[PDB]
Design a protein around this nucleic acid. Structure first.
Ligand SMILES: [Zn+2]
Lengths: 165, 22, 147, 645, 64, 80, 134, 127
RNA sequence: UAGGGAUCGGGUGGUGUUUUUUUAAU
RNA sequence: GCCGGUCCGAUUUUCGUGACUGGCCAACGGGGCCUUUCCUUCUGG
């Protein structure tokens, strides 16, 4: 309905139907999602069995997707269950695009550390590690995050939280 | 609160325009 | 142990199983001396891991404050081990309650590079990164004597 | 070597030619170098010359990939399809199986002993893999007994070597050879290697390894093709071993083929029930393609071919019934296909079809329609398969069980006792009369309030597509055409009714007002053009031309341009509405320009109409210019740049 | 494909709108089970917790 | 005394300086305050550096100090 | 010497408790600029007015480039103008009473520290050369 | 100063004192690949590049095996027929120790330099 | 080469006495 | 590699093979296309 109409398909029309069904459940989205703008969504298989759908946002509107992230994720997570939905921006360079899609891949915010350690054999290993926020929710989708970041740039990045886990 | 009467290009244009006029 | 712990047997050129928690290297391992199918290891996430080959899986993981160098099981208790780490005290853990290190042998000045139980089951040899070795008893917690 | 290490090194980037394509080299090369006399030996020989020294697993795995490329090249080749080089496969089998007081010395570092006292065995393992893949590619040509009876001692020797890569090939070769028949020597070899794969399941502490999986496929072949099965208790053990591995991946096709194999081969085991339960939950709840399919296959094979009791036969059925309410779109599809297989191949159908139609109706009322269309197809198969009593109870439930009740009754009548269908159609005609009355008038009032329900309406449109009752329903459908999907369904129904069965002038006025104030809009434009061509005939044609002038957003504009180019005595009964095309003389603008050029491609009266339209436009421009000159605004004529920017 | 939402939650209500024994067939088809699995690391964490429970249950043989 | 020079105890990193840790960062939090005059909310920095004023009724919110600024005795705050 | 500075965090995005748009910050900073306030004062009044961290994080770029884009550029940069203002103030005080030899010393030091920055600005050529402090 | 020289002086005098984990604040990819090739030779243990955006810090878990590292501050061209003179002038023996040179792959030692048959300038020695 | 105590100036946290409360301050 | 099918023979299910078919799955490589969105700044006439 409100997607770019150059190449539609069934699951993106289904999640646009989820958007306008949230609009049918009207009294909270006071024309705030009328400036929505997709570019493309895409399903990606991960190693956890399930799939992650990446929805793209053209990034004058990533700040338009501002307070709507949490409510629409918990809306389409009961609507179109057992997937993992992640918004991303897109476009001497392209490392900036890599860590920017990382920083908007995890959450609107909350990465706090990049470490890389080098074993004695020669294997590098590069950890990114979140800060402490909403860990009881973000622990579930941690394998999907490293899976889709490895699928999207080929860098082998392992995610971590400074806690017992 | 503590604005400057100088230091901006358009404000020093206004100051020199006032000096040109009178 | 290496990038992640592997389990071979001598009839295969390829690893039979791979048993890590996450992609984190593992500094040292040790099997038991009885109830042989379980084992312990230590990785440079400052972490002690246990594993069980009967379930063929890791089973628990504690994280101390510094990196454990060398672990060693007890050949008479079968569920107690000593643990030698870079803070200058060899801890002595009970397995089935890994919340409390039920002893701590606390006499060195530098990193505790290795420990082992005597097969009589009550003496600990340790050897430090400083140029000295010590012998402890299990039931005391300070040094019996020093070479 | 050096070029390969510089290519696989990281710090050399900026070229397109250093992505190197290095193995299509030999994949194309041995399509021509297969003289199979000397040059294949010169392929194999520097591999040995580099392999004698030292190797890593890096160079080992890329070398094994290279020899895989050689083997797919030989299968793609057509120079050795008849027994001329099985000599060389046999050849590769036969080639696999005080004094220093004055001596000066520098170079204090010694020789590392690790060089070849194993790695000769690495050579033996890998070209044993090469030659056994050669035999498994010559299975494509022929399977001759007397040409590899002389091979089978080397085959059992390389099986009893157990250096993983040779076992992966030899279990495949025995899988292909189990169809054949050698002598009692093969009977001993087959029972021996069956004991061997039972031994490797006994010692390997996982069945989700490639060796154990392919060995389970070999156990499937040994069950399926022999005269002598063996050891009920040991196959019970190996199935109890494979049972807890069903959850975690890298187990799928080979073990599930073994499952399908022995459940076809009918043996009764207490652990088959447990693996049936776990594979049923796997079939519903899995997340990988075709694994749910093969688990559905083995679960259907167990559920039909084996013998349960009343409790299991009830609980699995209600498990399917409420597995229909699973939240995915594909696990629901797989349980739909399971009910489809139960439907296609009954007294259990008579016991289950009522609740099955009810649950598939609930799945039709469920989520986004890729499951609801399959539910409609399955309910159509069930209603076609129903003899009398299931259809009777279904008609009772459709006639008894608000808006969902009416939509369910309408869809049930749309699917499928014509007299009971006529009584239900009388109830449906009463419902359509009470529904399609002034709701379309209030909808037209809402459209007028814009440019100043619909579930029962789409149900009535579907029921009118299903079915002077036709005349009264045609009047009600004309009232209903008199929100966008409802108008689309009503325009389709009005075209069908005008095809099947002034009043036609009023129907044309309602259709023109509906098209004025997308694919159904094209079909409505086609129906209106057909009605005007079948056509107060001159007054209706003049009103049609004036309606086309008032019409000429983008879809209706393209339909208006297409209708004008299709409508325009060459010009005597045509010169009425060319002024809109003269006024039409950004993609909507491009489509309108293409349709305007097509209409201009499609004489004296044309010049007359063009002069009249140009004079009317010039008089309008003169009136606007005089109004501006006598009323002389600039903000409204200049703010468009600020609004666009 | 004609997907009107209809706001209805009427499985048992659609069953309970007729004469006798149709509700008997509807009760004969009633399980209401088989929820969705959790992600991979949470399933791994819970079954290695279970493995820890059975390993402590094993070495409690040696406890005496 | 003798700790790992990688990730130390969280008590130790909160103990030491905000520049001397591994990845330096802030220790000032943004907090939202309820204006007691007209009961609306506004954001304010911890080390506020200026007497910030409400947009509805510009009474006062926090007189600045060297470190944290003192909230002005009728205001109700929350960290965020 | 001593260290006393800000510690800009590891994240580089708007801190997600933000409940305000992006161009509104631009309107706020051009409003304070048309009020006539220096960029560092824009930065602190934007740290405290509405909860931004700084403009390179919350907007697309820094306040100097966004004010040059909105057409309110300064003809001389902040530190240059502030050292000139301090120099003329201490010069006026010394000409009020010439006996302040410590103010003479500090005027020499401020003259040196402003000629260093004038050398940097001339050699990078962001002010028009011939500019050599009157 | 020279960041490479101060980094190698940091791990050198920390080894001379006798610590285990050495922090090393000013990092760069030259130091990364430097002590990467020295950990290939096993002269330290593993290490870590903690990445904050300003410079990145280095922590090395060296065990005991260094006795002297260092650099040579004039990084001059050195021919292949002169690294033998430079090994004899820098190290206590021929094969005891190494000397790593910057070259056309870049952080090779002199054994790998004579293997790959390239050379370049000398940036540091380690033994 | 490293460690510890005390003091001055600034900041953070704690929670007892000095303090006090609708005049401002801190 | 999985599966369905036209067949011959046994069958009124299902299997042996020979053909042949498509529905799909992974590994290879080949040809394009999108990541120079649609819009402003060269050394000289
Ligand atoms: Zn207020």
């Amino acid at each position: 309905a409100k997607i770019l109409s150059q190449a539609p398909t069934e699951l993106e029309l289904q999640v646009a139907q989820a958007f306008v069904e949230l609009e049918n459940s009207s009294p909270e989205l006071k024309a705030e999602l009328r400036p929505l703008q997709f570019k493309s969504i895409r399903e990606i298989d991960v190693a956890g069995g399930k799939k992650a759908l990446a929805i793209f946002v053209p990034v004058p509107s990533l700040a338009g997707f501002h307070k709507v992230q949490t409510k629409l994720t918990r809306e389409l997570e009961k609507k179109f269950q057992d997937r993992h939905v992640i918004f991303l921006a897109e476009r001497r360079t392209l490392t900036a695009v890599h860590d920017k899609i990382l920083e908007d891949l995890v959450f609107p915010t909350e990465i706090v550390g990049k470490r890389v350690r080098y074993l004695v054999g020669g294997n590098k290993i590069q950890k990114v590690l979140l800060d402490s926020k909403d860990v009881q929710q973000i622990d579930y989708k941690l394998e999907s995050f490293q899976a889709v970041y490895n699928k999207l740039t080929g860098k082998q990045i392992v995610f971590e939280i400074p806690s017992e886990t | 609160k503590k604005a400057k009467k100088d230091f901006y290009r358009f404000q020093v244009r206004e100051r020199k325009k006032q000096e040109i006029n009178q | 142990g290496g990038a992640k712990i592997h389990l071979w047997d001598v009839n295969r050129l390829k690893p039979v199983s791979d048993l890590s928690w996450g992609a984190d290297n593992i500094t040292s391992l040790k099997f038991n001396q009885n109830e042989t199918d379980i084992l312990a290891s230590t990785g440079s996430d400052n972490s002690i891991v246990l594993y069980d080959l009967r379930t063929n899986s890791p089973t628990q993981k504690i994280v101390q404050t510094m990196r454990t160098n060398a672990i060693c099981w007890n050949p008479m208790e079968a569920f107690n081990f000593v643990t030698a780490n870079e803070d200058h005290n060899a801890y002595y853990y009970d397995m089935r309650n890994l919340s409390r290190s039920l002893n701590v042998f606390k006499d060195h000045v530098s990193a505790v590079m290795d420990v082992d139980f005597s097969p009589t089951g009550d003496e600990i040899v340790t050897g430090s990164y400083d140029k000295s070795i010590r012998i402890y008893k299990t039931n005391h917690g300070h040094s019996r004597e020093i070479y | 070597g050096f070029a390969g290490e510089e290519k696989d090194s990281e710090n050399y980037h900026t070229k397109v030619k250093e992505i190197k394509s290095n193995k299509s080299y030999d994949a194309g090369e041995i399509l021509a170098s297969n003289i199979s006399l000397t040059e294949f030996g010169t392929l194999l020989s520097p591999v040995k010359a580099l392999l004698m020294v030292r190797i890593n697993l890096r160079n080992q795995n890329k070398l094994s990939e290279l020899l895989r490329r050689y083997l797919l090249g030989l299968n793609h080749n057509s120079d050795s399809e008849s027994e001329s080089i099985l000599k060389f496969c046999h050849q590769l089998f036969q080639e696999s199986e005080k004094e220093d007081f004055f001596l000066v010395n520098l170079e204090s570092k010694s020789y590392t002993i690790n060089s070849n006292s194993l790695l000769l065995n690495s050579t033996l393992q890998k070209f044993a893999l090469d030659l056994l893949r050669n035999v498994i590619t010559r299975h494509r040509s022929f399977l001759t007994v007397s040409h590899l009876e002389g091979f089978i001692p080397f085959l059992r020797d390389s099986l009893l070597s157990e250096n993983e890569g040779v076992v992966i090939s030899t279990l495949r070769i025995l899988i292909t050879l189990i169809r054949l028949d050698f002598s009692d020597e093969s009977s001993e070899i087959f029972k021996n290697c069956a004991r061997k794969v039972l031994n490797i399941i006994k010692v390997s502490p996982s069945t989700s390894s490639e060796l154990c999986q392919m060995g389970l496929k070999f156990l499937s072949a040994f069950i399926r093709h022999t005269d002598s099965t063996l050891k009920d208790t040991a196959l019970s053990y190996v199935l109890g071993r494979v049972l807890p591995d069903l959850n975690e991946p890298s187990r799928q096709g080979l073990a599930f083929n073994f499952l399908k194999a022995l459940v076809s081969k009918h043996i009764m085991l207490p652990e088959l029930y447990d693996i049936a339960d776990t594979t049923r939950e796997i079939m519903v709840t899995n997340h990988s393609k075709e694994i749910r399919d093969v688990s559905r296959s083995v679960y259907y094979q167990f559920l039909m071919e084996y013998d349960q009791s009343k409790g299991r036969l009830e609980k699995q059925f209600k498990f399917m019934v409420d597995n229909l309410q699973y939240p995915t779109e594909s696990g629901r599809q797989s349980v739909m296909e399971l009910i489809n297989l139960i439907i296609t191949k009954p007294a259990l159908l008579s016991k289950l079809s009522s609740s099955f139609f009810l649950a598939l109706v609930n799945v039709s009322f469920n989520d986004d329609a890729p499951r609801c269309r399959e539910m409609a197809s399955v309910l159509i198969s069930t209603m076609l398969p129903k003899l009398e009593n299931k259809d009777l109870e279904i008609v009772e439930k459709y006639i008894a069980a608000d808006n969902a009740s009416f939509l369910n009754l309408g869809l049930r009548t749309y699917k499928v006792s014509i007299g009971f269908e006529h009584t239900i159609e009388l109830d449906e005609l009463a419902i359509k009369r009470i529904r399609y009355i002034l709701s379309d008038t209030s909808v037209g009032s809402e459209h007028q309030w814009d440019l100043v329900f619909s579930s029962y309406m789409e149900a009535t449109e579907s029921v009118y597509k299903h079915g002077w009752d036709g005349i009264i329903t045609c009047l009600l459908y004309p009232h209903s055409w008199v929100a966008n999907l409802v108008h689309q369904l009503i325009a389709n129904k009005d075209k069908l009714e005008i095809s099947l069965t002034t009043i036609a002038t009023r129907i044309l006025h309602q259709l023109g007002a509906p098209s004025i104030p997308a694919n159904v809009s094209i079909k409505t434009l086609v129906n209106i053009s057909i009605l005007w061509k079948e056509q107060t005939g001159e007054d209706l044609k003049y009103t049609t031309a004036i309606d086309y002038m008032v019409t000429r957003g983008i879809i209706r504009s393209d339909e208006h341009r297409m209708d004008s180019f299709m409508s325009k005595a060459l010009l005597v009964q045509v010169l009425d509405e060319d002024e809109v095309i003269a006024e039409g003389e950004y993609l909507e603008t491009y489509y309108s320009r293409a349709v305007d050029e097509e209409q201009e491609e499609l004489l004296e009266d044309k010049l007359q109409v063009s002069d009249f339209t140009k004079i009317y436009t010039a008089v309008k421009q003169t009136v606007l210019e005089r109004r501006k000159e006598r009323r002389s605004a600039d903000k409204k004529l200049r703010k468009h740049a600020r609004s666009r920017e | 494909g004609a997907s009107g939402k209809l706001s209805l939650t009427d499985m048992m209500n659609v069953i309970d709108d007729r004469q006798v024994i149709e509700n008997a067939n509807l009760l004969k088809g009633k399980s209401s089970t088989y929820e969705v699995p959790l992600p991979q690391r949470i399933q791994q964490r819970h079954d290695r917790k279970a493995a820890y429970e059975i390993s402590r249950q094993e070495v409690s043989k040696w406890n005496d | 005394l003798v700790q790992d020079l990688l990730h130390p105890t969280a008590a130790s990193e909160a103990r030491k300086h905000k520049l001397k840790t591994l990845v330096q960062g802030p220790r000032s939090y943004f907090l939202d305050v309820k204006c007691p005059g007209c009961l609306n909310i506004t954001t304010v920095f911890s080390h506020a550096q200026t007497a910030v004023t409400c947009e509805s009724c510009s009474t006062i919110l926090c007189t600045p100090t060297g470190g944290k600024a003192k909230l002005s005795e009728g205001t109700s705050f929350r960290r965020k | 010497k001593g260290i006393s500075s800000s510690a800009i965090p590891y994240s580089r995005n708007a801190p997600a408790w933000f409940k305000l748009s992006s161009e509104s910050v631009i309107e706020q900073i051009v409003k304070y600029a048309r009020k006539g306030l220096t960029p560092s004062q824009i930065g602190v009044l934007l740290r405290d007015a509405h909860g931004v961290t700084q403009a390179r994080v919350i907007t697309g770029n820094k306040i100097m480039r966004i004010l040059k884009s909105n057409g309110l550029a300064p003809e001389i940069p902040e530190d240059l103008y502030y050292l000139i203002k301090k120099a003329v103030s201490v010069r006026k005080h010394l000409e009020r009473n010439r006996k302040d030899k410590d103010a003479k010393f500090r005027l020499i030091l401020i003259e040196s520290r402003i000629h260093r920055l004038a050398r940097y600005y001339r050699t990078v050529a962001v002010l028009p050369p011939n500019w050599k402090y009157e | 100063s020279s960041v490479l020289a101060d980094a190698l002086n940091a791990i050198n005098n920390a080894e001379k004192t006798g610590k285990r984990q050495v922090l090393l604040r000013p990092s760069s990819k030259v130091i990364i690949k430097f002590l990467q090739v020295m950990q290939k030779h096993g002269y330290i243990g593993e290490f870590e590049y903690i990445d904050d955006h300003r410079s990145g810090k280095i922590v090395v878990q060296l065990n005991g095996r260094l006795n002297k590292c260092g650099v040579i501050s004039p990084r001059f061209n050195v021919k292949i027929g002169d690294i033998e003179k430079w090994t004899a002038n820098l190290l206590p023996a021929r094969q005891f120790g190494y000397v790593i040179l910057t070259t056309s792959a870049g952080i090779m030692d002199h054994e790998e330099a004579r293997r790959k048959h390239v050379s370049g300038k000398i940036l540091g020695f380690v033994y």
